[PDB]
Subunit: 135 residues, 2 copies
């Protein structure tokens, strides 16, 4: 069973988001891009939820690399940040699958996560069928 | 190109949600279960966003019928209603793809919708490959 990885500058938020998710996933938890890549090199993640507004490397810059390296992973930005249009285009340039806002509701967060997981499953099995039919 | 159907008791909310969505979909708009089924019998909808808390027939009761009749359609409940557990189990009994809360943010709503559309596309093409490989 693959994990969900939560990536956020602010550890209180990581531990809150995990409360909403632990009952339904293996939750993995990272405190910035660097830590999160370290985890991605190390194990199997179906879904990532990542704060945009982090020190140093942004959510999208992080997730653009992820889209490059683990293309199968479903990517989600979440931010409480009252919106710049620039952030949106940046999010839109990268293929980000969901944008969520803060504060989040546990049932909405959970539902987004489950929905990202089902999408991971579909894409992955969609690809299995392409490869297999070719043969 | 298939539509998004918004279903809500309260027409102000329908016309607001369409503002967030019109630039990216053909938005269709219904003011209760009955009106919404009438539209579903009549045309092609990839995604439905539907208030739960409607007079007479509920969001889930509506969407359970929809799951029966147009199984390909991606189904979304949205409600400002501060939560009963009963509502959640009911939502969970039916295969509802997203639960959203009110008030909604235009970029989060739009993102949910786009994401439901991509999922409609995947499921639909996932099925096209099953059928075709069988042959």
């Amino acid at each position: 069973a693959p994990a969900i990885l939560l990536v956020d500058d602010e550890p209180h938020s990581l531990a809150a988001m995990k409360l909403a998710l632990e009952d339904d996933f293996d939750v993995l938890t990272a405190q910035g891009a660097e830590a999160a890549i370290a985890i991605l090199e190390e194990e199997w993640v179906q879904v990532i939820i990542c704060e945009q507004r982090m020190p140093g490397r942004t959510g999208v810059d992080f997730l653009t690399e992820v889209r490059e390296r683990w293309p199968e992973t479903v990517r989600i930005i979440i931010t409480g940040y009252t919106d710049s249009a620039s952030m949106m285009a940046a999010i839109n340039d990268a293929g980000i699958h969901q944008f969520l806002t803060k504060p989040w509701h546990p049932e909405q967060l959970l539902s987004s996560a489950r929905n990202a997981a089902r999408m991971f499953t579909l894409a992955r099995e969609n690809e299995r069928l392409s490869l297999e039919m070719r043969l």
